């Protein structure tokens, strides 16, 4: 087992130069350094470590280091170099699953961290936590160039090579080894009967928990689909931007003549301030003097202003009744502009040269093992039920990537699971009601007959209502879904509670398992804990933040892992079938939101093979962990991501 690091010229997008590399060994204990002219010897040492049957340790290796090696081995000295995934291990993957809760333990330590590293899984943060850090590189470099005449306001301190970069690389691999000796010192994930510094690639994975393999495979898959990208249309979204930019310039000239300007107190200094529809304070003052009583006070001195109070509002002047709809439309168009093009993290400022968008996908960002998305966020664009929703999802299509050998568009297949957490709930409480609850779920659609038996107008309101009622609501927040008072909210809870009397029994069992005593305060709550963590489906310690949300962190944390194994198995079957992954192959992963997957492929027969093998992969997921239920998905075929939602 070796521990190595890299230094490059820039990020993974455009990397063209190797600088230095330090390899430390657990068999000879040598700081084997390398040079810019010694990159071939570095690759020979890595291939000798691969061929002997060992493991190579990196930090953020799946996302950054391994494709940088693969690119620099080809574009500098023209030789193929591929690392197997069963030999490369990462320390940033292990930092997220053992220590999955840093924001709830960073206080009391902030005396150590400067403040900018608050809850950071970066290696400099752990160097500050392990108290092994002989200064920084960026700040010392900036201080050196401010000591010299030439200043460097850019902040990309990886152009030239020197010896200080070698010294901080040695410091970086020392910090990496210091993180690895602590992260391997856990007893719940690694059994304390064998040393993990001398085992092969068939022993380190097969003599530990299942959670350490699935997370590294998911990190490999998510780094690969991050490297793949997502096709995007530039002209169709500029047409939308030039469409809805001349709309808010009409909604301000027409509106300020209705709601006039006024003087505001700054001998008494006054100012001539005009109506700003973006502020929620001016609209409140203009609805006070228009003859309206809010009858709703969330704040201690101010009413609430949102979409549900601007619908049931009546004034005497009939012009303001039509103007409030224009105010709501202006706020919607303002949010559309802020999300689409004019935002700091907008769509048009993260488009690559090949017309694609590469988004950061964090595999373990939530406290319940749910993956998050950032820079940009591709899982929060408006749906088809929202206004200007179909015109946005038509641009995020897979038919905008012509093939490089034929010049033809491709076909997008989107596969969603229906009733995931509600079927997992039937899996958990099957030992209480003897398992006659998951049979009605398999008998037709559950949300349709729930809508019929609950007289909700839409299926979406019923799907919102059932997960509102299930995850610990109140008396008014689920009466707010139907718009009635607390009496209907009480009678619907008494209706849906007496149907299946196994939810309260499972809740009482979980409360008897976790908590033992709970002292009550009139303004707080003092809870003496007994077991803070919950064993998951793979022995992972799932953290609990609040005791009345234990059903939440027991349900959705067990629902993400089956999807995380299913997205692995649905390509492990296709690779063994004899297909090819990548843009020059047969299929390519594009987007993985919490429920559905979006794959893009060349011909429709490949989409048929994918939609056939997805059910078999989901069946293997349901069979591998011995589930009492029967899992099922549903797929759609189309040109873009407006039909396949």
């Amino acid at each position: 087992m070796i521990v190595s690091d890299i230094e490059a010229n820039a990020l993974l997008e455009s990397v063209t130069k190797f600088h230095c590399g330090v390899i430390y060994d657990y068999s000879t204990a040598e700081y084997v350094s390398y040079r810019p002219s010694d990159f071939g010897a570095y690759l020979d040492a890595l291939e000798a470590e691969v061929a002997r049957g060992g493991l190579i340790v990196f930090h953020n290796g799946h996302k950054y280091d391994v494709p940088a090696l693969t690119k620099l081995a080809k574009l500098q000295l023209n030789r193929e170099f591929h690392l197997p995934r069963e030999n490369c291990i990462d320390t940033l993957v292990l930092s997220r699953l053992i220590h999955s809760n840093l924001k709830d333990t960073d206080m009391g330590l902030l005396r150590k961290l400067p403040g900018k590293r608050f809850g950071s899984h970066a290696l400099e943060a752990w160097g500050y936590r392990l108290g092994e850090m002989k200064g920084e590189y960026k700040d010392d470099f900036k201080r050196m160039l401010e000591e010299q005449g030439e200043e460097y306001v850019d902040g990309m301190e990886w152009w030239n090579f020197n010896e200080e970069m070698m010294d901080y690389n040695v410091q970086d691999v020392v910090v990496t080894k210091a993180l690895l000796e602590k992260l391997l010192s856990d007893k719940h994930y690694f059994p304390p009967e064998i040393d993990f510094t001398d085992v092969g690639y068939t022993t380190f994975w097969s003599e530990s928990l299942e959670a350490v393999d699935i997370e590294h495979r998911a990190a490999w898959l998510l780094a690969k689909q991050e490297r793949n990208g997502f096709p995007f249309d530039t002209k169709a979204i500029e047409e939308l931007y030039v469409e809805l930019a001349a709309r808010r310039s009409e909604l301000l000239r027409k509106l300020t003549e209705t709601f006039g300007s006024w003087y505001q107190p700054k001998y008494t200094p006054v100012e001539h301030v005009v109506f700003n529809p973006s502020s929620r304070d001016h609209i409140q003052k203009k609805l006070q003097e228009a003859g309206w009583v809010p009858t709703k006070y969330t704040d201690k001195g101010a009413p609430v202003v949102d979409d549900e109070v601007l619908e049931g509002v009546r004034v005497d002047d009939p012009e303001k009744q039509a103007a409030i709809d224009l105010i709501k439309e202006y706020l919607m168009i303002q949010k559309r502009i802020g999300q689409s093009a004019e935002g700091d993290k907008a769509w048009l400022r993260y488009v690559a040269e090949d017309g694609k968008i590469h988004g950061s996908v964090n595999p373990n960002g939530a406290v319940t093992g749910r993956a998050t998305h950032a820079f940009p966020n591709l899982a929060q664009i408006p749906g088809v039920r929202s206004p200007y929703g179909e015109q946005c999802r038509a641009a995020f299509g897979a038919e905008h990537h012509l093939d490089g050998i034929t010049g033809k568009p491709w076909v997008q297949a989107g596969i969603d699971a229906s009733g995931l957490e509600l079927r997992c709930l039937a899996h958990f409480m099957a030992r209480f009601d003897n398992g006659e609850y998951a049979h009605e779920i398999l008998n037709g659609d559950i949300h349709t007959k729930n809508q019929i038996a609950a007289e909700l107008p839409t299926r979406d309101n019923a799907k919102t209502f059932i997960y509102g009622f299930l995850y610990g609501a109140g008396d008014e927040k689920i009466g707010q879904i139907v718009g009635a008072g607390k009496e209907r909210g009480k009678e619907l809870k008494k209706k849906f509670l007496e149907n299946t009397p196994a939810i309260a029994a499972l809740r009482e069992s979980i409360q008897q398992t976790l908590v033992e005593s709970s002292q009550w305060v009139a303004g707080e709550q003092q809870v003496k804990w007994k077991r803070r963590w919950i064993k998951g489906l793979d022995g992972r310690k799932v953290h609990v933040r609040s005791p009345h949300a234990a059903l939440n962190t027991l349900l959705q944390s067990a629902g993400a892992l089956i999807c995380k194994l299913w997205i692995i198995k649905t390509e492990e079957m296709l690779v063994e079938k004899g297909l090819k992954h990548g843009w020059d192959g047969d299929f390519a992963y594009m987007a993985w939101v919490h429920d559905e997957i979006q794959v893009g492929c060349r011909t429709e027969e490949i989409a048929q093979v994918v939609i056939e093998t997805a059910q078999e992969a989901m069946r293997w997921v349901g069979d591998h962990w011995n589930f009492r239920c029967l899992l099922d998905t549903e797929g759609k075929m189309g040109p873009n991501w407006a039909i396949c939602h």
Partner: protein, 217 residues
């Protein structure tokens, strides 16, 4: 503008160059130093006469501006005072190139620099004709730009014939090739460069394909 800035009154200090790759020994040998006046650290270059008398300063700031201390002479060369003889000189375009060549040769060859640049190089090479007579070979080292080609073409007219040889570089000039690690390819250009051929005259044998091309038109 005022006077020659002394290092004592301006808090002079000899340091290295991290962003360009020059240690403090070369700037100690030459006299390119750093003043701390008005808060902002100013870079400043020193000019000397043949005997060693300080005659001119070149003041540059953090934001690429120029400041002359007074009467800038036409025979002002950066590095002329240190060497008074030799068989092979290298004339650099700027001032960091001469320090870069001093770094890669351990202070062996007589290497100087210009005082005007590529704009008024012909006047300062015509006014320094008597200094180049005591030498045996001259290696012109200019930028790989259109202005650099114009300077190496037109400034090589007032020079003595038979002693001018021009080297080529893959970078902009020698300093980025020092930064990109091309320290072996520059020494061959110092030792074996190309003579003063491409002025505009052609050979009788080099046209053999091109006359064919006009024969195929």
């Amino acid at each position: 503008t005022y006077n020659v800035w002394n290092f004592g009154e301006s808090n002079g200090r000899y340091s290295a160059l991290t962003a360009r790759g020059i240690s403090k020994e070369t700037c100690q040998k030459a006299g390119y130093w750093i003043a701390k006046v008005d808060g902002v650290m100013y870079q400043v270059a020193d000019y000397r006469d043949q005997n060693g008398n300080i005659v001119s300063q070149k003041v540059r700031d953090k934001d690429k501006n120029f400041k002359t201390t007074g009467s800038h002479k036409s025979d002002a060369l950066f590095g002329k005072h240190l060497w008074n003889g030799g068989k092979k000189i290298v004339v650099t375009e700027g001032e960091i190139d001469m320090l870069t060549v001093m770094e890669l040769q351990d202070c062996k060859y007589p290497v100087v620099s210009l005082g005007h640049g590529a704009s008024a190089a012909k006047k300062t090479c015509a006014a320094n004709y008597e200094y180049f007579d005591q030498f045996e070979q001259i290696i012109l080292m200019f930028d790989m730009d259109e202005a650099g080609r114009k300077a190496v073409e037109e400034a090589a007219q007032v020079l003595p014939a038979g002693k001018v040889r021009v080297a080529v570089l893959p970078c902009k000039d020698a300093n980025e090739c020092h930064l990109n690690g091309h320290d072996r390819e520059i020494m061959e250009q110092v030792w074996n460069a190309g003579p003063w051929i491409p002025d505009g005259v052609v050979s009788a044998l080099s046209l053999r394909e091109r006359i064919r091309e006009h024969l195929s038109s």
